[PDB]
Protein backbone atom coordinates (compact mmCIF):
# COMPACT_ATOMS: atom_id res chain seq x y z
CA UNK A 1 0.00 0.00 0.00
CA UNK A 2 2.85 2.39 0.83
CA UNK A 3 3.78 2.93 -2.83
CA UNK A 4 0.20 3.54 -3.91
CA UNK A 5 0.09 6.40 -1.42
CA UNK A 6 3.15 7.98 -3.03
CA UNK A 7 1.69 7.55 -6.51
CA UNK A 8 -1.40 9.41 -5.34
CA UNK A 9 0.74 12.25 -4.00
CA UNK A 10 2.65 12.61 -7.26
CA UNK A 11 -0.59 12.64 -9.25
CA UNK A 12 -2.19 15.31 -7.05
CA UNK A 13 0.89 17.51 -7.19
CA UNK A 14 0.86 17.25 -10.98
CA UNK A 15 -2.77 18.27 -11.30
CA UNK A 16 -2.17 21.30 -9.10
CA UNK A 17 0.85 22.30 -11.18
CA UNK A 18 -1.24 21.96 -14.33
CA UNK A 19 -3.93 24.31 -13.06
CA UNK A 20 -1.51 27.01 -11.94
CA UNK A 21 0.38 26.61 -15.21
CA UNK A 22 -2.55 27.34 -17.49
CA UNK A 23 -3.86 30.16 -15.32
CA UNK A 24 -0.44 31.77 -15.63
CA UNK A 25 -0.66 32.05 -19.41
CA UNK A 26 -4.30 33.11 -19.37
CA UNK A 27 -3.42 35.91 -16.96
CA UNK A 28 -0.36 36.94 -18.95
CA UNK A 29 -2.48 37.19 -22.11
CA UNK A 30 -5.05 39.39 -20.40
CA UNK A 31 -2.34 41.60 -18.88
CA UNK A 32 -0.66 41.88 -22.28
CA UNK A 33 -3.79 42.88 -24.17
CA UNK A 34 -4.69 45.35 -21.40
CA UNK A 35 -1.18 46.88 -21.44
CA UNK A 36 0.19 46.77 -25.01
CA UNK A 37 0.48 50.12 -26.77
CA UNK A 38 2.02 51.75 -29.82
CA UNK A 39 5.16 52.87 -27.98
CA UNK A 40 5.96 49.25 -27.11
CA UNK A 41 4.61 47.72 -30.32
CA UNK A 42 6.93 49.90 -32.39
CA UNK A 43 9.78 48.84 -30.12
CA UNK A 44 9.00 45.15 -30.65
CA UNK A 45 8.86 45.49 -34.41
CA UNK A 46 12.08 47.49 -34.24
CA UNK A 47 13.73 44.72 -32.23
CA UNK A 48 12.74 41.93 -34.59
CA UNK A 49 13.54 43.86 -37.78
CA UNK A 50 16.93 44.64 -36.24
CA UNK A 51 17.57 40.89 -36.33
CA UNK A 52 15.18 39.88 -39.14
Amino acid sequence: AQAEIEAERKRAREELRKQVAILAVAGAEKIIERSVDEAANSDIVDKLVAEL
Binding site: A1, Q2, E4, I5
Partner: protein
Protein backbone atom coordinates in the same frame (compact mmCIF):
# COMPACT_ATOMS: atom_id res chain seq x y z
CA UNK B 1 -6.96 -67.65 17.41
CA UNK B 2 -3.92 -66.59 15.38
CA UNK B 3 -6.12 -65.58 12.47
CA UNK B 4 -8.80 -64.01 14.67
CA UNK B 5 -6.15 -61.85 16.33
CA UNK B 6 -4.79 -60.95 12.90
CA UNK B 7 -8.25 -59.75 11.89
CA UNK B 8 -8.37 -57.03 14.55
CA UNK B 9 -4.65 -56.35 14.14
CA UNK B 10 -4.89 -55.45 10.46
CA UNK B 11 -8.13 -53.63 11.22
CA UNK B 12 -6.42 -51.38 13.75
CA UNK B 13 -3.30 -50.72 11.68
CA UNK B 14 -5.20 -49.80 8.51
CA UNK B 15 -7.76 -47.77 10.48
CA UNK B 16 -4.97 -45.89 12.26
CA UNK B 17 -3.48 -44.94 8.90
CA UNK B 18 -6.92 -43.91 7.59
CA UNK B 19 -7.74 -41.60 10.49
CA UNK B 20 -4.15 -40.31 10.37
CA UNK B 21 -4.91 -39.30 6.79
CA UNK B 22 -8.21 -37.60 7.60
CA UNK B 23 -6.50 -35.57 10.33
CA UNK B 24 -3.89 -34.31 7.85
CA UNK B 25 -6.70 -33.46 5.44
CA UNK B 26 -8.20 -31.30 8.18
CA UNK B 27 -4.69 -29.90 8.66
CA UNK B 28 -4.43 -28.66 5.09
CA UNK B 29 -7.98 -27.34 4.94
CA UNK B 30 -7.53 -25.39 8.17
CA UNK B 31 -4.25 -24.02 6.83
CA UNK B 32 -6.10 -22.75 3.78
CA UNK B 33 -8.85 -21.12 5.83
CA UNK B 34 -6.29 -19.56 8.19
CA UNK B 35 -4.28 -18.09 5.33
CA UNK B 36 -7.31 -16.78 3.44
CA UNK B 37 -8.61 -15.06 6.58
CA UNK B 38 -5.22 -13.50 7.29
CA UNK B 39 -4.98 -12.22 3.71
CA UNK B 40 -8.54 -10.89 3.55
CA UNK B 41 -7.87 -8.92 6.73
CA UNK B 42 -4.47 -7.64 5.59
CA UNK B 43 -6.17 -6.19 2.53
CA UNK B 44 -8.47 -4.05 4.67
CA UNK B 45 -5.50 -2.99 6.78
CA UNK B 46 -3.88 -1.74 3.58
CA UNK B 47 -7.11 0.01 2.61
CA UNK B 48 -7.24 1.71 6.01
CA UNK B 49 -3.78 3.20 5.63
CA UNK B 50 -4.65 4.16 2.04
CA UNK B 51 -7.80 6.02 3.09
CA UNK B 52 -5.89 7.75 5.88
Amino acid sequence: DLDLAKASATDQLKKAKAEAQVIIEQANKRRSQILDEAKAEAEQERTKIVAQ
